[PDB]
């Protein structure tokens, strides 16, 4: 919206980069018994047929 | 506004200044479970993550 000013549009942007480095720190960080999930591009393999 | 008196200007002076030393003495107390939150400059790190 054109209505607000800028010295207000300056919180909205504030926010939107702290939940843009939230997105970053939840990519980075999270990992399963020492293996993380959302840093590369591999395909997991899971053998079952034995 | 001009309309005031100086007689006034005194008393809206004593308001302001004692509003002023309030700001300071909030400012240097209130702390949290021993530990200051407003008078150091510096940046509080907390880990989520085993």
């Not at 054109?2 to 909205?12: A, F, K």
């Not at 843009?20 to 999930?37: K, W």
């Amino acid at each position: 919206t054109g209505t607000n000013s800028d010295s207000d549009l300056d919180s909205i942007q504030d926010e939107i980069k702290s939940r843009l480095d939230e997105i970053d720190r939840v990519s980075g960080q999270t990992q399963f018994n020492g293996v993380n999930v959302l840093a590369k591009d591999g395909s997991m393999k899971i053998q079952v047929g034995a």
